[PDB]
């Protein structure tokens, strides 16, 4: 109260000083009980690859990825590479290919090669890529007879749209069918390197999910109910109590949403029940004092909470179950304004001295000592 | 096998308050949800046929069939219907459904008697044989075919009706529950059916949906439809 009012003397009255909040006690995480590991040897190391204009998908699905082994062979999009290791999803889409040194930045969510004309990487890309430079190992002139580059067509394609037709296309003033002319060209030419193919490994991560099959290397813990806990359900972090919902979820539904843009309920990844996301109890703190000219004894009102959701046992609150750094008080009384700690309730009615709420007022009277 | 048939002029009918499906997988209950999505416009002109004409697929098609028994046994989806691009075929063969994405090569008038739908099924890339989508002129079947980038969403409903047989697509409301979510990466611009018949087209509109205590839609209002609805 003194630091809020910026004074060493406090007048008589009730003062709103801080907010009562409850710490999470257990820090729990819930992942599906999987014991598999990702075979990254097939991911990083291979000898034959598909083309720059028609690449394929070696999808590593249902395999628990670890990203500390990334540098055994970078650019990263969507999620920064320090925290791909805690995300959870269902499938990993592999989108690997080969490139040229003048094409190292043209297959991207942003920046301009044959991939924009025959098979394209999306701009809304939520995966992380690996930039491997393989001239110093695979030393040769021609990469492959199936690796070819071109300059333009008459129209661009969508991401993952495949059209590898070998025909002259027209951006000029006349149609051409095997005819050279103004913007009638067939620029599809094969690679010829000088001192050597280069290779990129892409792992696209999906959205709009089923219940998740793949997680990070974090070890899941036990489920704690009816207490304020710090939870993590398949990447969904938060703090609150986990009670049973009694909600009619369909089996393909994994999350329930309230009025606001947040999650109200979540399906447990292991035991498949439905748990409410209810944040643990809080309220304003009101400090009732008769004035530092009169006394230093104060009473504390925790607004809008029960007397069971508040620190009552002041001798065991050095273990910090609450965001309140201290805990004082002797007498505990329940008021519709909140749980009042520090004032002894009497059955005698007096004129209102310090208002609290719902017909209850506080005063500093003689009972014989002052309290 | 190609077989010769008789061409007829089309008819038109009213849509009433019919053609509302579940837009998302999130289970909302006891609310009023404002959504901006593909829907059939209310009180629109639904094209009514009795033949099997080749119709466009203008970004989602509401389909309905009123019949006594199993007559219309499936659908055909694609851009071109020769052996040049891939296409989708759904056949409700008596005790099963066969769903194929292949290259295909159809005849001019595909129909079910025997099987004369196509001639070749080279390079089959998706197949799904399961419980037939068709269920139970008393029978009414509703479907919504929505081709989003990556997915082909079919929504369905089956209803025993007792109305007048011509010009009487019945008034009332029935939400169309999701039936199947095909993971097909093909372009779809045109569709055909296999042998009443109703085809309406979806448009991006704004709807107000009423979610009850059981999570089932029981009322839908279109602001665009009327100022009071707005």
């Amino acid at each position, epitope marked *: 109260t003194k630091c809020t009012l910026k004074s060493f003397t406090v007048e008589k009255g009730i003062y709103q000083t801080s907010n009562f909040r409850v710490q999470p006690t257990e820090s729990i995480v819930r992942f599906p009980n999987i014991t598999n590991l990702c075979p990254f040897d097939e991911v990083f190391n291979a000898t034959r690859f598909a083309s720059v204009y028609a690449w394929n998908r070696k999808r590593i699905s249902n395999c628990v990825a670890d990203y500390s082994v990334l540098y055994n062979l970078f650019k990263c999009y969507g999620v920064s590479p320090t925290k791909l290791n805690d995300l959870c999803f269902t499938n990993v889409y592999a989108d690997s290919f080969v490139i040229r040194g003048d094409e190292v930045r043209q297959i991207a969510p942003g920046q301009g090669n044959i991939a924009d004309y025959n098979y394209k990487l999306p701009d809304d890309f939520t995966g992380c890529v690996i930039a491997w430079n393989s001239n110093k190992l695979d030393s040769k002139v021609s990469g492959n007879y199936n690796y070819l580059y071109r300059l333009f067509r008459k129209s661009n394609l969508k991401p993952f749209e495949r059209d590898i037709s070998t025909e002259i296309y027209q951006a000029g003033n006349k149609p051409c069918n095997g005819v050279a002319g103004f913007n009638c060209y067939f620029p599809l030419r094969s690679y010829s390197f000088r001192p050597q193919p280069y290779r990129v490994v892409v792992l696209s991560f999906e959205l709009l999910h089923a219940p998740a099959t793949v997680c990070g290397p974090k070890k899941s813990t036990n489920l704690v109910k009816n207490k304020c806990v710090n939870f993590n359900f398949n990447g969904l972090k938060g703090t609150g109590v986990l009670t049973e919902s009694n909600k009619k979820f369909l089996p393909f539904q994994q999350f329930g949403r309230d009025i606001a843009d947040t999650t109200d309920a979540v399906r447990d990844p292991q035991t498949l029940e439905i748990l409410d996301i209810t944040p643990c109890s809080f309220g304003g703190v009101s400090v009732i004092t008769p004035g530092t000219n009169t006394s230093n004894q104060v009473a504390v009102l925790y607004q809008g909470v029960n007397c069971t959701e508040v620190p009552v046992a002041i001798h065991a609150d050095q273990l910090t179950p609450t965001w309140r750094v201290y805990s004082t008080g002797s007498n505990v009384f329940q008021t519709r304004a909140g749980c009042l700690i520090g004032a002894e309730y009497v059955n005698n009615s007096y004129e209102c001295d310090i208002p609290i709420g719902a017909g209850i007022c506080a005063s500093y009277q003689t009972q014989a000592s002052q309290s | 096998n190609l077989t010769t048939r008789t061409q007829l002029p089309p008819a038109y009918t009213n849509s009433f308050t019919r053609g509302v499906y579940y837009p998302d997988k999130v289970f909302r209950s006891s609310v009023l949800h404002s959504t901006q999505d593909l829907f059939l416009p209310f009180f629109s002109n639904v094209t009514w046929f009795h033949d099997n004409p080749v119709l466009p697929f203008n970004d989602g098609v509401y389909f309905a069939s009123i019949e006594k028994s199993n007559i219309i046994r499936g659908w055909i989806f694609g851009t071109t219907l020769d052996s040049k691009t891939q296409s989708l075929l759904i056949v409700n063969n008596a*005790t099963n459904v066969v769903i194929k994405v292949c290259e295909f090569q159809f005849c001019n008038d595909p129909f079910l008697d025997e099987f004369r739908v196509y001639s070749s099924a080279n390079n089959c890339t998706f197949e799904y044989v399961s419980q037939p989508f068709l269920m139970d002129f008393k029978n009414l079947r509703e479907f919504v075919f929505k081709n989003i980038d990556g997915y082909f969403k079919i929504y369905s409903k089956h209803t025993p009706i007792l109305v007048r047989e011509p010009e009487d697509l019945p008034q009332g409301f029935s939400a169309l529950e999701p039936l199947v979510d095909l*993971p097909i990466g093909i372009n779809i611009t045109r569709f055909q059916t296999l042998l009443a018949y109703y085809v309406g087209y979806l448009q991006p509109r704004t709807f107000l949906l009423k979610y009850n205590e059981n999570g089932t839609i029981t009322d839908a209002v279109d602001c665009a439809l009327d100022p009071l609805s707005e």
Partner: antibody
Framework: QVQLQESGPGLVKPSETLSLTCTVS??????????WGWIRQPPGKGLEWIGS???????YYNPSLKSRVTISVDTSKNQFSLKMNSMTAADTAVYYC?????????????????????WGQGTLVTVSS | QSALTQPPSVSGAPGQRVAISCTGS?????????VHWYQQLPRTAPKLLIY???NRPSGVPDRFSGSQSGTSASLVITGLQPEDEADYFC???????????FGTGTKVTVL
């Protein structure tokens, strides 16, 4: 010619380790790309479902078997394994391997129904002893 | 979730119509979708006998079928055979839990 062979021991004490293996006899039908399940039937009681697996993942479990024990499919060896670790006293029963329905190719679909069509012979396990 | 009410037994006099039924809630059978009946001879695997509320698989004869309508599903068996003395089970797909609920069974006895 669709037959389902089943294997697994039949007598354990409570808190013991056991596993049931289900193999395909060799028919291409009910071999690789199908939905699968296990059915438990107590002696003197009716059928009741315990286990089901859909494509690679997407496992649905009985409320009795929700976190009780897991299930696995080795697709290449046509092996359908249901672990049986530390069973409670009510699991003395005959167990059946069963294919649902539905061939599917190359993708991961989303169907809202279920089946059981072909059934194994059934293996008896005793745990109340 | 299940609510599956099924009679325990019914008279199985041969050459005579036997109608059996199971009724659940309005979430699995009342959706008019995915209810199966299984036939189980004693010491024999319970094969899939009829599916799709009336749809008959390969090998199952005629005059012996299903008549589901709404919340109640029912089999009609006209002309009971001596090989049809078995136990008949239901199975329905619910949307709230998908617990794949089964019936208690109707053990037919011939006389």
């Amino acid at each position: 010619q669709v037959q389902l062979q089943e294997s697994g021991p039949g007598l354990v004490k409570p808190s013991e380790t056991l596993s049931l293996t289900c193999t395909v006899s060799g028919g291409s039908i009910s071999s690789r790309s199908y939905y699968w399940g296990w059915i438990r039937q107590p002696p003197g009681k009716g059928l009741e479902w315990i286990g089901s697996i859909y494509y690679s993942g997407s496992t649905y479990y009985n409320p009795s078997l929700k976190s009780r024990v897991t299930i696995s499919v080795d697709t290449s060896k046509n092996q359908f394994s249901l672990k049986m670790n530390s069973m409670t006293a009510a699991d003395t029963a005959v167990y059946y391997c069963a294919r649902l329905r539905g061939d599917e190719i190359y993708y991961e679909s989303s169907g809202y129904y279920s089946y059981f069509d072909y059934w194994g012979q059934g293996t008896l396990v005793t745990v109340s002893s | 979730q299940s609510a599956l009410t099924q009679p325990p037994s019914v008279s199985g006099a041969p050459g005579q119509r036997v109608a059996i039924s199971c009724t659940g809630s309005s979430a699995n059978i009342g959706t008019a979708d995915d209810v199966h009946w299984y036939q189980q001879l004693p010491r024999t695997a319970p094969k899939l006998l009829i599916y799709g509320n009336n749809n008959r698989p390969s090998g199952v004869p005629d005059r012996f079928s299903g008549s589901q309508s709404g919340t109640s599903a029912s089999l009609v068996i006209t002309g009971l055979q001596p090989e049809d003395e078995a136990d008949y089970f239901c199975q329905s797909y619910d949307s709230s839990l998908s617990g794949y609920v089964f019936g208690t069974g109707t053990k037919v006895t011939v006389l």
